[PDB]
Amino acid sequence: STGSATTTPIDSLDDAYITPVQIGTPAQTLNLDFDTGSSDLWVFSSETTASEVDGQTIYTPSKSTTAKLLSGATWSISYGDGSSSSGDVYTDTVSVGGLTVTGQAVESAKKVSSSFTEDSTIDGLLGLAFSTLNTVSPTQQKTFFDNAKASLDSPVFTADLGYHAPGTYNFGFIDTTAYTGSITYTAVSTKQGFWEWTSTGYAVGSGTFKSTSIDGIADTGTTLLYLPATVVSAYWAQVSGAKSSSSVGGYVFPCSATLPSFTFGVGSARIVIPGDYIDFGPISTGSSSCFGGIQSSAGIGINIFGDVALKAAFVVFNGATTPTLGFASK
Template identity: 50%
Template sequence: MKVPKAVTVGQGKLNLDLDTGSGDLWVFSTETPKDQSQGHNLYMPTSKSKRLDGYSWEITYGDMSSAGGDVFLDTVSIGNVTASSQAVESAKKVSDQFAKDKATDGLMGLSFSILNTVEPKSQTTFLDTVLKQLEKPLFTCNLKHGQPGSYDFGYIDDSKHTGEIAYTNVDNGQGWWGFTAESYSIGGGSNSTHSFHGSQHRGAPGSSIDGIADTGTTLMLLSDDVVQEYYGQVQGAKNDEQQGGWVFPCDARLPDFTLSISGYNAVVPGKFMNYQSVGSVCFGGLQSVGSSGGVPNIFGDVFLKSQFVVWDTEGPRIGFAPQA
């Protein structure tokens, strides 16, 4: 489940989704139309807030949800980390998906700042704004399956993971936390389909899978051939157009899914692949990214909840270890 983080924006607390797949910090505010903002906590610009005259923003996400508005500079704090002059994007319009999601009052983008949509001059993400004051130029996430997880900025809490952290290089050329898994396997031991193997996925050589680590995407979205291979191991699984993806009997045995990343095997337990029940069947946590060009494979929350993850801007690099 997605559990938004309480963030102090200006004078008030808002529940924001921390999203490593985008670069905008935007909020429901007193400028948001009442029929869209009902039930949400609102950002209230004060005399201490500085409006950036002539600046605007508009963002559309992968699921086609969207928002847009104007821009203030204000104080933003998570825990004991404070940005004193952070671009806060005030929503003057939001799509239905956001209006109906009463648990969330906006998003905090934690991608690289190149993805920020503010015009005429893009603004820095919260992470880039506070980077110099952090002990280390990184943050970590320890997301959990079926319970609240945690984020830490500027340090690594070694009590939250076991073993060494395995790092791999990040390709941030497009602003995302992109990395390559050298190979993958389905199942384990004698049930494993092929240990590590592969054909080419999304233009990567050999058996590798290129993708982005994205806390803002709930599911794991990979290429058709990988997804079909996985559900080929699940009795009764089918791609159901009505449900919008792969479904299976709720009591089906789901194999583990393992990604090999710089020699480290990141295992997603099979039970994580049961995302939710829809009627008499269950909807899979692994789905197809689709065939539209330019959409990367996405290692979303289903994958990230299986790992302790370090997002290090130096390098940049991303690190994985088993959760404690």
């Protein structure tokens, strides 16, 4: 089998992407944030504290003839940005772009933190990291991909995120029309439960490529590109007036600037992030100070190839017995 679904930016800055997901019988369609950096499929629901729901579409398990309470199971998750959610668990039928999993753990939120409440466009998350990170207790549950894998034509999914435009998540096949040149594959460590890999270096604008190993994670659920302070300083030094602002929480730059591109290495291959992808707009409405899309990972404890990087590529998440990651230009 295969599946194919369009993923759509939630706003004009590509702060996140939402993909429609069918849950239950009859289908209840929720728009979920597909997150290769976590491993829980959780939804706003009829069980979510009412004051914490503000515009989201909810899953109502009592209206699904295939929903079953997973007795005794609870979940609770905290994300890198400090947001969180928790609740109980149902199993139900979940379909993405025509690909159907029966008995998928659907984690129903009883509580969500303010950032979730305040984002009316995201109805939940669909985790695509390794199932070892799933938070369901006392019996850990499998991701949608892990459940689908054996049925797929090939044990892969691909992320093709757009810049200020829709893109595509495919399951079970590689669309050879969706990229240019070849896909370069690179080794993955699953030891921390992430799609963790090592970039071979970087360049800033038309500058020379610096060969250096940068370990980090391919994370569709993180907006920005988080890299070591040395790398980030080298980038922003090429933007007149750019500076790190402790009050704002990162590098900012004059909105009048033209940003240079940023290149990262995948083996001997190179992915080029155009400068415009690195502009996240005014820090506050009407400001002429703009927020940068490349930020320091210092104090995160891990480098993160988030949407800023991934959207410059066609990305293969290869879930073969030994997983690997592939990157192509597009």
